[PDB]
C-alpha cells in the first residue's frame, strides 16, 4: 500500500499537474476526454507487455462492428481468467494500482466523475493487426462510468500515424447524433492512456483500422459506479435522424393490378423485349425462369450470377472503373456533392448513396430539421436532369464527369419499371406493393452497415394479404479483385437471430431474399486495403400473396 504511488509517474500526485489536467479535460473537444503520457512505471509496464506476449493466446474475432484479436472469450480454453493471474504477476499489479484508492481519488478528481468502484475491476486485453478495427460506439453499457485505454505498442519504436490504429472521437450534431466524420484522432504510444467519462448520446469514438503489418497491444478498461455502500457510496446521492430512412413508397394501383392479374410465364413479347434491354438472356428463358422459380420456392431467396446482359455489364464496368481510377472520391461528408448523400449516423452506418431525393448534406442540426420538416420523394429522372446541367457547366472532363452516376441511375429506373416488377412477381409468385431503390457506394476505410432487421411498414401491419416479410434485392457491381476470402470486408451477410448468405463483393450478381422479422443483414466494413469501393443497387419491397 506504500509502494502504490511510486508505481506511477510522480507527476500525477502533484497538485499543479492535477489541477491543470482537470481544466484540460473540462475544456476538451468534442466531449470531455484526456490523455496522460508515461503513466506507469516504465519497468513495470515493460514487464506487463512481455508477460502478455508470452502468456496470453489471442484469437481473431470478427463481427459487424469489429475485427480484433481477443483474449476475453471464456468457455474457450484460450479465454483469459482474471481470477487466475498466477503467471501474470505484473498484470495483477497493474490492475491493483489502477483500481487503488489512491489512483481512483486522482482520476475521479480530474475527470469530475464522482466516486469510482475499486472492486468492480473491468479490463480486457486485445491486439490489433493489419485490417483490425472497431467501428463507432459510445461505450454506454451498465454501470460503466469512465473508459480508459492504456497502450502498449513496441516501447522502443514510435507508432506512426500512417500505421493506423488511431483512437477517433466524433463530435455531436445533436444528442445521440454524432457527426459522420471524426474531429480528433489520437496516435497512441507506449505507456500512454486515453480516457473519457462515458456519456450517453455523446461519447462516440472508434478505432481506426490498422493499415500495416504490425501488432498493437492495448488494455481497455472501465471504472464503474461503486457497489452500494462501497466506500460509503449511496445510489442517487432517434429513428428520425437516420438517413436514408428504412421506408418504402407504395406503388400505383395500375402496377399492383398488373401483378395480380398475372398471378391469377405470362410475359408478352414486348415485355421480354423491354427486360432484355438490361437482363441476361439466360435469366429470361423459359428454363431459366423455371429454375429461378423453383430455387425461390425452396429457399425463399435467389443468388443470381451474371444478372445483367453483356452490353449493360460492359457499360457499367467501364464507367465505374473509370471513376475509381481517375476521379477524387470524397472522404469527408462535407465534400460529398449531388447526387450523392452520406448515410448517418455513424454508430449505425456510413456509406454514399443516391436515392433520387433533393440534395442533403447534414453538417448541422438545422440541416437535419430542415429535411424532417420538408420530406420529399425520390425522382430519378429529375436527378438525371440536375446532373446533366451541373455536368455541362464544368465540362465533363475525365476528372469530373457523371458517367457512372448516369448509368447507375438508368439502371435504377429499369428496376423501378412496371415491367421489371412484373418479372420479379413472376420469379417469386409475390405481388410487390411498395418500393425503395438506392444506389450505394462503400469506400475503402470508411463505409459499412451494422446488423439490423427489416422494418415493417406500420400502416400495412393490419393487412392480411400483405406478407410479414420484406423482399430485398442487391445487385452488386464491384469490379475489383481480391475479395474472395472476406478479408477485405464488403461482404453481404444475412443471418438468423447461423448464416444464410455470406457473399463478398463480386461483379454483376443479384441476391434476393424474403426477410422475415428476425433475419439480420449487414455489409461488412470495407478495408482500407480494398482495391475499389463496393458498388451496388439496393431494392426493397413490401409484398402480398396472390
Ligand atoms: O481495445 C481498444 O483499444 C478499444 C478502444 C476503444 N474502445 C474499445 C471498447 O471495447 O469499447 C476498445
Ligand atoms: Mn470503446
Residue numbers in the entry: 23 to 259, 279 to 305, 328 to 560, 587 to 635
Task: Please quote the authors directly.
OGFOD1 catalyzes trans-3 prolyl hydroxylation at Pro62 of the small ribosomal subunit protein uS12 (RPS23) and is conserved from yeasts to humans. OGFOD1 in Homo sapiens, Sud1 in Drosophila melanogaster, and Tpa1p in Saccharomyces cerevisiae were found to catalyze prolyl 3-hydroxylation of the highly conserved Pro62 and Pro64 of uS12 (RPS23) in humans and yeast, respectively (Ban et al., 2014; Katz et al., 2014; Loenarz et al., 2014; Singleton et al., 2014). We describe crystal structures of the human uS12 prolyl 3-hydroxylase (OGFOD1) and its homolog from Saccharomyces cerevisiae (Tpa1p): OGFOD1 in complex with the broad-spectrum 2OG oxygenase inhibitors; N-oxalylglycine (NOG) and pyridine-2,4-dicarboxylate (2,4-PDCA) to 2.1 and 2.6 Å resolution, respectively; and Tpa1p in complex with NOG, 2,4-PDCA, and 1-chloro-4-hydroxyisoquinoline-3-carbonylglycine (a more selective prolyl hydroxylase inhibitor) to 2.8, 1.9, and 1.9 Å resolution, respectively. Prior to its assignment as a uS12 P3H, crystal structures of Tpa1p revealed that it contains tandem DSBH domains, only one of which, the N-terminal domain, was predicted to harbor the catalytic machinery (Kim et al., 2009; Henri et al., 2010).
We determined structures for OGFOD1 and Tpa1p in complex with the broad-spectrum 2OG oxygenase inhibitors N-oxalylglycine (NOG) and pyridine-2,4-dicarboxylate (2,4-PDCA) (Rose et al., 2011). Following optimization of hits from high-throughput crystallization trials, diffraction quality crystals for full-length H. sapiens OGFOD1 (542 amino acids [aa], 63 kDa) and S. cerevisiae Tpa1p (644 aa, 74 kDa) in complex with Mn(II) and inhibitors were obtained (catalytically inactive Mn(II) was used as an Fe(II) surrogate). Tpa1p crystals were monoclinic and contained one molecule in the ASU as for the reported Tpa1p structures (Kim et al., 2009; Henri et al., 2010). OGFOD1 and Tpa1p bind 2,4-PDCA slightly differently. In the Tpa1p:Mn(II):2,4-PDCA structure the 2,4-PDCA C-4 carboxylate is positioned to form a hydrogen bond to the side chain hydroxyl of Ser240, yet surprisingly is not positioned to form a salt bridge to the side chains of Arg238 or Tyr173 (corresponding to Arg230/Tyr169OGFOD1), respectively; in part this appears to be due to the unusual conformation of Arg238. These observations provide further evidence of flexibility within the 2OG binding pocket of the uS12 hydroxylases, a feature that might be exploited in selective inhibitor design. In all of the OGFOD1 and Tpa1p structures, the inhibitors ligate the metal in a bidentate manner. Previous structural studies on Tpa1p, which is reported to be a homodimer in solution, identified a large dimerization interface between the CTDs of two protomers (buried surface area ∼1900 Å2) (Kim et al., 2009; Henri et al., 2010).
